[PDB]
Amino acid sequence: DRDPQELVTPVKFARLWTEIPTAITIKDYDSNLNASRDDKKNKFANTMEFVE
Amino acid sequence: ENEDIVVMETKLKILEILQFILNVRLDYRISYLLSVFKKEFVEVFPNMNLDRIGEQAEAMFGVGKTSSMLEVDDEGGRMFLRVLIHLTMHDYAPLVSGALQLLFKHFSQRQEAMHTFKQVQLLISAQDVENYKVIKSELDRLRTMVEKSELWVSENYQIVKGILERLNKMCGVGEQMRKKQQRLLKNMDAHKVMLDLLQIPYDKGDAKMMEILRYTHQFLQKFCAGNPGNQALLHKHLHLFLTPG
Amino acid sequence: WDYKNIIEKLQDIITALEERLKPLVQAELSVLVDVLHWPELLFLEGSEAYQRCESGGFLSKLIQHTKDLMESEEKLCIKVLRTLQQMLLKKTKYGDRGNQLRKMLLQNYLQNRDWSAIAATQCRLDKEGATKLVCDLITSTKNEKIFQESIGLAIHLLDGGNTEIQKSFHNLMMSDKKSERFFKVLHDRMKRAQQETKSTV
């Protein structure tokens, strides 16, 4: 619980026509935010693994 | 208070997590809906087969195996349902409240999905997305201030007047942008928030907050220009304006 | 691309999807009602939780929590009241697709396998305190919607002129020390209604 970490909204109600893909998969759904998730998880990756 | 309060809270947090996960699943379903809609639009418009879209929507609700990974249990929801039933019988009050809430939500996936899909707003321009975000922030700030107005009804006057002035200035541009922004504000129920600003109990003579009402009314005049729908929606509240002035 | 065309197509797909899945929503709600009807079937027969569900402990806990949560979670109280109303209501058909979805969901979850039935359900709910729940909310509700839902649930409880439910209602009225207020509440509405009538006439 520090400044770099911030709450997230699970559901997004604002969408952009061009950004919407023709087809969507779970892997792509993760991949869109995977860059941010990975670059923020490195600090707590070990705690992530321990918790799991 | 409970002797096992630690475990009570453990499963309370576990249900918290599961509800968050259900929200993310709903987001994924909405994205799937929008993606299939865009595919249909592009293929049809480089008629549209509503039957195929309906079939896909029906399939994605766990009816077919194509949506198994969405389901959060390996038993087809039996384990989740049994967990909720067991929790509802627990002594703790908020734990039972949460268990009941998830139980009710799990049997209302389709209606919730359609409601959220209707709530979805589509913008083709990224600049329009930024406009929506700034309007949302301004509306949220004004709504929060109106909800707790006893403080200012000094520091809560300048910000309010600036927000109102910015909204009024951005409200009207040309004719197409005017209609687009009118519809946008209609979706976010901004008119309700700005109407709540008119019911604040105020002294007869202030000379400072009056300018605020000098602007709040103005926006409502621009919110109805060439928009019979806005006129109709604000007509349901017509009794508010039946005051000398 | 055209923004107006995109918006119109989005509206059309929204309407089509909403229309298509209505019977599915009704079937899912009916599945919820059925699950509440037989919670034990989900649990293992040998498990003590199954015995508790069979004895009606789950429904008793649900009713007690409904009474407790009315002060804070009014929406949840309304939802549970409507759920009991549906429980007392007779089975209804929601179309071939809705019926098929109902069967599939019941099989997936409930894997284990008439005015008289209405009276039996009413007596079971009375044993669980549904009549007490509606009376307590009505005498202790400040929300109009909660009062309406409780009155509807009580109406369904007395639907068909069940003697046992009427006797329980009367006994609660005599025993309850807040019964006066109950009457007052109803009486108050009556008076208001009369005035409202005189206002519109």
UniProtKB/Swiss-Prot annotation, chain B:
Annotated compartments: Endoplasmic reticulum membrane; Cytoplasmic vesicle, Secretory vesicle membrane
Subunit-level organization: Homotetramer. Homodimer. Interacts with TRPC1, TRPC3 and TRPC4. Interacts with TRPV4. Interacts with SIGMAR1. Interacts with PML and AKT1. Interacts with IRAG2 (via coiled-coil domain). Interacts with CABP1. Interacts with TMBIM4/LFG4. Interacts with CEMIP. Interacts with TESPA1. Interacts with TMEM203. Interacts with BOK; regulates ITPR3 expression. Interacts with BCL2L10. Interacts with CHGA and CHGB.
Sequence similarity: Belongs to the InsP3 receptor family.
Residues that, per the record, bind Ca(2+) 1: E147, E150
Superkingdom field: Eukaryota
Protein name: Inositol 1,4,5-trisphosphate-gated calcium channel ITPR3
Shown stretch of the complete protein: 958 to 1257 of 2671
Taxon lineage: Eukaryota, Metazoa, Chordata, Craniata, Vertebrata
Modification note: Phosphorylated by AKT1 on serine and/or threonine residues.
Function of the molecule: Inositol 1,4,5-trisphosphate-gated calcium channel that, upon 1D-myo-inositol 1,4,5-trisphosphate binding, transports calcium from the endoplasmic reticulum lumen to cytoplasm, thus releasing the intracellular calcium and therefore participates in cellular calcium ion homeostasis.
Annotated gene: ITPR3
Tissue: Expressed in intestinal crypt and villus epithelial cells.
Protein's organism: Homo sapiens (Human)
Disease cited in the entry: Charcot-Marie-Tooth disease, demyelinating, type 1J: An autosomal dominant demyelinating form of Charcot-Marie-Tooth disease, a disorder of the peripheral nervous system, characterized by progressive weakness and atrophy, initially of the peroneal muscles and later of the distal muscles of the arms. Charcot-Marie-Tooth disease is classified in two main groups on the basis of electrophysiologic properties and histopathology: primary peripheral demyelinating neuropathies (designated CMT1 when they are dominantly inherited) and primary peripheral axonal neuropathies (CMT2).
UniProt comment concerning the protein's domains: Composed of a large N-terminal cytoplasmic domain (CD) followed by a juxtamembrane domain (JD) and a transmembrane domain (TMD).
From Swiss-Prot, chain C:
Domain of life: Eukaryota
Cellular compartments annotated: Endoplasmic reticulum membrane; Cytoplasmic vesicle, Secretory vesicle membrane
PTM entry text: Phosphorylated by AKT1 on serine and/or threonine residues.
Family of the protein in this entry: Belongs to the InsP3 receptor family.
Physiological role: Inositol 1,4,5-trisphosphate-gated calcium channel that, upon 1D-myo-inositol 1,4,5-trisphosphate binding, transports calcium from the endoplasmic reticulum lumen to cytoplasm, thus releasing the intracellular calcium and therefore participates in cellular calcium ion homeostasis.
Comment block on domains: Composed of a large N-terminal cytoplasmic domain (CD) followed by a juxtamembrane domain (JD) and a transmembrane domain (TMD).
Oligomer and partners: Homotetramer. Homodimer. Interacts with TRPC1, TRPC3 and TRPC4. Interacts with TRPV4. Interacts with SIGMAR1. Interacts with PML and AKT1. Interacts with IRAG2 (via coiled-coil domain). Interacts with CABP1. Interacts with TMBIM4/LFG4. Interacts with CEMIP. Interacts with TESPA1. Interacts with TMEM203. Interacts with BOK; regulates ITPR3 expression. Interacts with BCL2L10. Interacts with CHGA and CHGB.
Disease: Charcot-Marie-Tooth disease, demyelinating, type 1J: An autosomal dominant demyelinating form of Charcot-Marie-Tooth disease, a disorder of the peripheral nervous system, characterized by progressive weakness and atrophy, initially of the peroneal muscles and later of the distal muscles of the arms. Charcot-Marie-Tooth disease is classified in two main groups on the basis of electrophysiologic properties and histopathology: primary peripheral demyelinating neuropathies (designated CMT1 when they are dominantly inherited) and primary peripheral axonal neuropathies (CMT2).
Name used for this protein in its record: Inositol 1,4,5-trisphosphate-gated calcium channel ITPR3
Source organism per UniProt: Homo sapiens (Human)
Gene name, Swiss-Prot/TrEMBL: ITPR3
